[PDB]
Structure 1
Amino acid sequence: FRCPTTWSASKLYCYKPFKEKKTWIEAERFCAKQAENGHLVSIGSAAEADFLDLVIVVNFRYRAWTGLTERNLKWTNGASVSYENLYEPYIRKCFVVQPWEGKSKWYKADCEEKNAFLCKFPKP
């Protein structure tokens, strides 16, 4: 099981950063075109975070979309929040990774901001 050229392989996944700047949704859609089950990167452990940091350093100050976003509000009874009388608007953000003291940290960003982005897909 060989990751395509330019992608970096962990045991189970192929990863690749792309420099071309895109909104969160068009980055996600770009990742999904790359492969079966392709998405913006998810980070499931410290070891994956460290591996992803290496992927970034091999390829590249960076600011890149991850697959992490905020959910819609949902009432405790399970209903969607359609109507609201919120004092301040709830606006779902998405998360970029940026360098912070030699590792990286995840920061909220406007989903319509154009950024570099990171794709992941499962081998097989």
Structure 2
Amino acid sequence: CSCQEKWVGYRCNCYFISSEQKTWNESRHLCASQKSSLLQLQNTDELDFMSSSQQFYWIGLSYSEEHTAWLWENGSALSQYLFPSFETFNTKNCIAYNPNGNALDESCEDKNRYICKQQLI
């Protein structure tokens, strides 16, 4: 399950954990730019390794008034028991996440780091 240059492999998946801080719509595009996409958490334990990092990251979850629901990049709804805070998330924000499970919602125009992930050959 080999991956491209500065990409990290785990569970036969390729992840990209950026150093630069960008906008959620940018990163969104940078990942897309690389045939990958703004992280869709298949579960809280997707980043075992990064286990501690006390910093948040941008992820592919964003609200969507058209389906009155939070959605991942491919349009799957957000599981209600995934993130707990859930109900707090101010629909006008993006979702930032922390390897240790914690997750925030900050202006989609802030400047956090991003995480792309190539999932299927």
Query: What TM-score does the superposition give when structure 2 sets the normalisation length?
Result: 0.68
Structure 1 residues not aligned, in runs of 5+: 76-89
Contact kept in structure 2, 1:8 and 1:55, CA below 8 Å = no
Q: Which structure has the highest strand share of the two?
A: 1
Asked whether the 8 Å contact 1:3–1:123 carries over to 2, the reply is no
Task: Pick one of 36, 50, 66 that aligns with 2:59.
Answer: 66
CA distance in 2, matches of 1:5, 1:123: 17
For 1:8, the aligned partner's letter is: V
Tell me the distance in 1 between the aligned counterparts of 2:10 and 2:17. Answer: 14
1-structure distance, mates of 2:15, 2:67: 33
Note the 1:22-61 alignment, pairs <5 A: 22-35=22-35, 38-48=36-46, 52-55=47-50, 61=54
113-122 or 22-31, which deviates more: 113-122
Deviations 1:30-50 (A, max 9, x none): 001112xx11111012432xx
Q: Is the 8 A contact 1:16 1:55 kept in 2?
A: no
Query: Number of residue pairs matched?
Result: 100
SS in 1 for 2:114: strand
Q: What is the percentage of aligned positions where both structures have the same residue?
A: 27
Q: Identify which of structures 1 and 2 has the higher relative contact order when contacts are C-alpha pairs closer than 8 Å and 6+ apart.
A: 1
Which residue matches 1:78? none
RMSD: 2.5
Given that 1:31 and 1:40 are in contact with CA atoms closer than 8 Å, whether structure 2 keeps it comes out as yes
Contact 2:95 2:103 in 1 (8 A): yes
The whole-number CA distance in structure 2 between the counterparts of 1:2 and 1:15 is 11
Contact 1:63 1:97 survives alignment (8 Å): yes
Distance 1:123 1:61 in 2: 29
